[PDB]
């Protein structure tokens, strides 16, 4: 019976030594305790476009509450390259390669219609609204 | 865990482990945005160990949602002035 609910933002993340930035976009959709997301970041390290990534994950989102989610991936994928319209598979870094043997929490923060406010684990916590389609 | 809510006031949630620095923050980002007659549907910041974020919610248009990242420990005041910035560009 599920429908699928569809959720888009983006943020920009400015780097501790600020020589770069990243124009980061989520969509995410979501059918019973099943999601789907990708995740394109856009660097600019000169005020300039010099590297694109792209970011597919899936798996289950779990409901502990009407508050509190988790995220259990079973595959991410990632991408790169300097053109959006080539873009190469990229070797998964261990790092990121290791989000998948971890149950990453989604605390939601105020719930509307519309919108959604989480805390979640981006850079071991960050928050963010996501708009609801 | 995620710091919960430590400073809420009109507009702003501000959620950080530090109670004292939550406060700080809130009345001087309150005061800064009447300065620019900048008034937000909504504006959430969370404060961690080695990062800043806040999403600045408005009515009818895209959240406007940055995250800074910090080696260096940042006071109330160039975080209250990051999020004034960003919000204004
Ligand atoms: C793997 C590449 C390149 C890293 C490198 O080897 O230099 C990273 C560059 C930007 C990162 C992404 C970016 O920082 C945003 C997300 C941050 C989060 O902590 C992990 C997933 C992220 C979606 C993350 C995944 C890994 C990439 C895509
Ligand atoms: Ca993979």
């Known amino acids: 019976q599920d429908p699928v609910h569809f959720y888009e933002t983006s943020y920009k993340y400015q780097a501790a030594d600020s020589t770069y930035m990243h124009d980061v976009a989520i969509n995410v959709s979501i059918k019973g305790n099943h999601f789907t997301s990708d995740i394109i970041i856009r660097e600019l390290v000169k005020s300039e476009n010099k590297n694109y990534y792209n970011v597919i994950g899936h798996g289950d989102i779990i409901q502990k509450n009407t508050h509190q989610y988790y995220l259990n991936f079973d595959n991410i994928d990632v991408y790169t390259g300097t053109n959006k319209a080539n873009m190469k598979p990229y070797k998964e870094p261990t790092s990121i390669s290791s989000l998948i043997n971890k149950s990453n929490n989604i605390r939601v923060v105020y719930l509307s219609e519309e919108y959604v406010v989480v805390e979640f684990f981006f850079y071991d916590g960050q928050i963010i609204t996501l708009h609801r389609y | ?89």
């Not at chain 2, 919960?4 to 006031?9: I, M, T």
């Not at chain 2, 008034?39 to 940055?66: A, G």
Request: no cysteine; glycine share 2%.
């Open chain 2, 1 to 89: 865990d995620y710091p919960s809510l430590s400073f809420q006031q009109d507009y702003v949630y501000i959620f950080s482990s530090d109670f004292q620095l939550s406060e700080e923050l809130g009345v001087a980002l309150i005061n800064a945005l009447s300065a620019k007659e900048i008034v937000p549907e909504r504006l959430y910041v969370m404060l961690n160990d080695k990062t800043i974020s806040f999403s600045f919610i408005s009515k009818n248009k895209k959240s406007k949602n940055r995250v800074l990242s910090t080696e260096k420990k940042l006071n109330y005041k160039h975080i209250s002035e990051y999020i004034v910035n960003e919000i204004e560009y």
